[model samples]
Target: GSSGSSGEPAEIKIIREAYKKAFLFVNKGLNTDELGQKEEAKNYYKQGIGHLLRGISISSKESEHTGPGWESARQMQQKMKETLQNVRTRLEILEKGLATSLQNDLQEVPSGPSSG
Candidate 1:
């Protein structure tokens, strides 16, 4: 008996898991950010980015393998890239908001009382 259909490589499965984890972290980040926990949100975002980067790297490494499932892999890789960009953009927005709030706080701080 011969196997007729080709099977997906384990690398593809790994990528899928990586993306899932990354998205979960990103979602957590969004929720925390909504709750005004900027630092925690930032940490979650960084974690998500880490996973996304790893997944992309793994996908790149597996690019050489060609088969019926390779197309699906490539498509998933593209999706990961798009998600990475979106997540980074959101992170930048959060960072900018944090910086602006910090600056406002500094501006509101009275230095050694008022010098009349």
Candidate 2:
């Protein structure tokens, strides 16, 4: 962000970049959860830990006209958590429905009107 143009915290931006890098590592781990991938994910987590600390340090600071950033970050985090949790719940329900349908169909005979 252009500091002189926008009020975005340059320090926080750097820390958030670290966090995004960590998420990329996690995404890679999901694609291939081999031992090496897990090790890489661990390294990402370590980096994320450092970034979080630095981000929080900057968040503790107060702006000249605005209040502390912690409150804003907390609110944003809570909103994101709620959204993520809701999405996960919906996806889980859909998965369960598909699994149940598959299981029920498997028990049916492969002939006549009851054939799956």
Candidate 3:
């Protein structure tokens, strides 16, 4: 809450660092996904969402920006949300497919498929 009118707000700097961390997390997520490591990618995606939200909260606490930074940050937040949503959707699809396959396997063997 140190507003000396001499420099940027403390929250601004903290928020900037958080934003950087978020990008790192997102990149890691992408890397894991590219390597066919969906679970690891999902974890990193979650971590990135955390950092993104943390940055947004801190940005909220920042003093009113006299320039375009605030708008840019808000846009970044929206993009992050979209990215996280896409990842979650893909995970959900995989989970459902796996569940259905397992359910099929768990059915009574003789009662369902005839044994030769």
Candidate 4:
């Protein structure tokens, strides 16, 4: 989609691509978990988080207070933390949702289910 600002394609394309790539890798990790490969899944999850953060930070150039890179994101994070203090639990819940949604492929606990 073209933005009205320049009538150019969305400036966030790179950011969107980066995010998709990262999420795909993370999806692989989730699949690994489904296969009972816990360690591999953990690694993928970490990679996904790093990439997601990087993408969102970089994409800010099109956002309200657009910025760049991980450090820039840290500034955003700090301000957010300051603004969020007492109500930060809402943020925490959202974060928890992030992890849980991605963990959909997790294997059942050991010695349960089919083993039973």
Query: Which candidate has the highest TM-score of all?
Result: 1
Over the stretch 4-39, how does candidate 4's per-residue lDDT look in tens digits? Answer: 464324535545565566657755865876797656
1-116 per-residue lDDT for model 2 (tens digits): 43454555664455445445534443443443344344444444344344333433444344553546544554443443343344344334433454544522336455776636
Q: Which of candidates 2 and 3 is the stronger one according to TM-score?
A: 3
Question: Against the hidden reference, what TM-scores do the models get?
Answer: 0.65, 0.35, 0.55, 0.42
lDDT of 3 at 59: 37
Q: Indicate the residue-level lDDT of 81 in model 2.
A: 37
Count of clashing residue pairs in every prediction: 0, 0, 0, 1
> Where does candidate 4 have its weakest 10-residue lDDT segment?
82-91
Sequence-dependent TM-score of model 3: 0.55
Worst 10 residues of 2 by lDDT: 86-95
Q: How well does candidate 4 match the true structure in TM-score terms? A: 0.42
Pairs of residues at least 3 apart in sequence or in different chains that clash in candidate 3: none
lDDT of each: 0.77, 0.44, 0.65, 0.51
- Of the two candidates 1 and 3, the one with more favorable lDDT, higher being better, is 1
Which 10-residue span in candidate 1 carries the lowest summed lDDT? 100-109
- C-alpha RMSD (angstroms) for model 4: 15.5
**Clashes in model 1: which pairs?**
none
Better of 1 and 3 by TM-score: 1
